[PDB]
């Protein structure tokens, strides 16, 4: 009998939350931005093509300097490229070839990787010897790691396929805080510009907002009908965008706790693998399963352009800190730097 | 280019040479994906996923065991698009045991793996384990408990043939792939020999398809 009462209380709380969200929504973002000048057309060209991978590329991450980028692939390799000159700087062979995520430290000293091995391995790039050594192998997750992000040189936040995200202390190798609440596998992670509160998207068609210190869920966003694969904060930290298998991108605001706009096209029936914003945030670059990337005017839900040129699925794309370039990875073992 | 630019280019070229060498070395190495519901002893041992490397007659084998990954398969099964073959282990003694029937759950998993959109052309090696126990417990219990429409002799050979036929009859698109079935014995590494034969046949088919004379 108590279970029924608890379920009724939970349903009442959910109804109250829905009523509050409905009340807070008066004018749509499309209504407000109807009276702005649309972007005419975006025509980016492949400035560089980074070759050398012999397997599907599952992850990439730009550096803070916006010149060096890290890649991960099934060939058990993790390459740091010089994008300006197309020169390989390091070629780190991973102990596990099943890598699904890669990260670049903001300071540039370390890179991280993870995958089916249930380990986030930190690699020290700047050592007295000329090789990159494994700083340590972080363990504790039960499911595959989907996204690892550096907060600083000592703290790394990871998303796993055991429905829990974790915050680590690299010096001690211990989980400082474990985040719980997701029913499904967590497939995405994005840190706020202040590195203060981050958001994760899971396969329960929900996105949850966390705090690194307190380790509890501030907000829950539920708009999607399928599995969220990628997530990205707005540059101001007050909004984030999600990509899901139902061929729709959605914009959520943290303060209003609601979905503002949805990005969808009739000709698009494939899923979304990676989403990123421009430096200003008006362009939403989303990768897709149909071998190409799309540029969406984030304020008008209009397709500004298409980044075609990949012969297989686009798995990871990133936009540099200075906003000059966009680098898209694909399963055809080819990176391409756009403008 | 400057002096450091030239030296960086030379370093990148050395990295490219090493990458090409590693790719050539890893292209001839056979990748196997081991699944079950089941029986892994003597086949995988002789958190995370388990990597097993062994060599049989000038071929290097990698077998991946993903049984410890307790998550949704649809988000990590595409990592095994290029595996040479899928080794699937089904126990024959689970027809009368419940974890739905154990054998029926095994058949459902086999159907999902065989008809997955990533393995439309990936051969499956079906190892039917515990044949000694199945022969021991088949006289005292008929297969009608698992398959009510058996209508056949309750002997070891007929029962095994029926199980095998039910297993390859779940293989739609039965033109681009052959399912290899073997009842696991423990003499003279016959399981390894069967895996070798299946893998070399698959290698021949792949080479012929690549060369454009298929």
């Amino acid at each position, epitope marked *: 009998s108590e279970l029924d009462q608890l379920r009724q209380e939970a349903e009442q709380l959910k109804n109250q939350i829905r009523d509050a969200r409905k009340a807070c929504a008066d004018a749509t973002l499309s209504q407000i931005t109807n009276n702005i000048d649309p972007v005419g057309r975006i025509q980016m060209r492949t400035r560089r093509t980074l070759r050398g991978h012999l397997a599907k590329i599952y992850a990439m991450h730009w550096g803070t300097d916006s010149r*060096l980028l890290v890649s991960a692939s099934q060939d058990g390799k993790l390459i740091i490229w010089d994008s300006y000159t197309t020169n390989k700087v*390091h070629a780190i062979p991973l102990r596990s070839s099943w890598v699904m995520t890669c990260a670049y430290a903001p300071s540039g000293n370390y890179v991280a990787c993870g995958g089916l091995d249930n380990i986030c391995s930190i690699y020290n790039l700047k050592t007295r010897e000329g090789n990159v050594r494994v700083s340590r192998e972080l363990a504790g997750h039960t499911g595959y790691l989907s996204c690892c992000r550096f907060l600083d040189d000592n703290q790394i936040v990871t998303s796993s396929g055991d429905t829990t995200c974790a915050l680590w202390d690299i010096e001690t190798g211990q989980q400082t805080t474990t985040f719980t609440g997701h029913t499904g596998d967590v497939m995405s992670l994005s840190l706020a510009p202040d590195t203060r509160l981050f958001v994760s998207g899971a396969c329960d068609a929900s996105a949850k907002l966390w705090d690194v210190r307190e380790g509890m869920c501030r907000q829950t966003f539920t708009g999607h009908e399928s599995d969220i694969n990628a997530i990205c904060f707005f540059p101001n930290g007050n909004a984030f965008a999600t990509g899901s298998d139902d061929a729709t991108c959605r914009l959520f605001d943290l303060r209003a706790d609601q979905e503002l706009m949805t990005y969808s096209h009739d000709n698009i029936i494939c899923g979304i693998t990676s989403v990123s914003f421009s430096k200003s945030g008006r362009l939403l670059l989303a990768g897709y399963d149909d071998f190409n990337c799309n540029v969406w005017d984030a304020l008008k839900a209009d397709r500004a352009g298409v980044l075609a040129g990949h012969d297989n699925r686009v798995s990871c794309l990133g936009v540099t800190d200075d906003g000059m370039a966009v680098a898209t990875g694909s399963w055809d073992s080819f990176l391409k730097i756009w403008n | 280019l*400057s*002096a*450091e630019d030239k030296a960086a280019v030379e370093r990148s070229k050395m990295i490219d040479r090493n990458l090409r060498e590693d790719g050539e070395k890893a292209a001839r190495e056979v990748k196997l994906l081991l699944l079950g519901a089941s029986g892994k002893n003597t086949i995988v041992k002789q958190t995370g996923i388990v990597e097993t490397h062994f060599t049989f007659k000038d071929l290097h084998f990698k077998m991946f065991d993903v049984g410890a990954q307790r998550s949704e398969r649809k988000k990590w099964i595409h990592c095994f698009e290029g595996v040479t073959a899928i080794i699937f282990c089904v126990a024959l003694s689970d027809y009368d045991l419940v974890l739905m029937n154990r054998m029926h759950a095994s058949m459902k998993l086999f159907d999902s793996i065989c008809n997955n959109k990533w393995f439309t052309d990936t051969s499956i090696i079906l190892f039917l384990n515990k044949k000694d126990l199945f022969e021991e417990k088949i006289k005292k219990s008929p297969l009608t408990i698992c398959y009510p429409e058996y209508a056949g002799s309750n002997t070891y050979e007929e029962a095994a043939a029926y199980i095998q036929c039910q297993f390859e009859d779940l293989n739609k698109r039965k033109d681009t792939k052959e399912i290899y079935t073997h009842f696991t014995c423990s003499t003279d590494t016959k399981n390894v020999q069967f895996v070798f034969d299946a893998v070399t046949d698959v290698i021949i088919k792949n080479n012929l398809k690549d060369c454009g004379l298929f």
Partner: single-chain antibody
Amino acid sequence: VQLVESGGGLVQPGGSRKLSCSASGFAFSSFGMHWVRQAPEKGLEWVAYISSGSGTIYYADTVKGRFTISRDDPKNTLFLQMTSLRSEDTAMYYCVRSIYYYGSSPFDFWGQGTTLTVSSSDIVMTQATSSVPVTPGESVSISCRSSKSLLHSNGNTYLYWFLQRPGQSPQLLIYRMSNLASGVPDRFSGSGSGTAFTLTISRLEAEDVGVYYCMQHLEYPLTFGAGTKLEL
């Protein structure tokens, strides 16, 4: 990380000797290596250079055709074969580690150095000052000049600042301008542009006493400047 050399000794003029350097503590296969020689009372001079993989070699014009440089990666050793030794080849020979990628720190480590005694176009680096007197707790600026501008089209200026402590091998302080080498205290700074460079020490201590040398890596004669000696 350490480099030790061997050989040296008294060589009759016109003879030949093979200097060898042993590398320990680092991935010797991945670093290009240099030979920098110092006269018994003069500045540093660059002799030869062998790259990673033994795919790119250079010699100084004063030792070209008479010296041979080769490395043995499995043994972590390096050699410098000399033919037709002259009285001008007497010097203390140093082996220098140098790795070249983006953001690298070339000339980071220097060997102890072995002495060789023999019985009896190119960018010029100018360090006009010498025997500059210093007092502890005071700031000192050291100048350096180049015949050709060291600012490449990519924005990288190639000026290497070194520190020759009395009785010790040179230590890298600044590799590219305003790039402080690892392990160097954060009181050293580099500034300048084109053909003019300065090195500023915030508060010089007893360990900052020595001879400071320049380098250009723009081309492949590697030229130094007669160092400026700081004395208490």
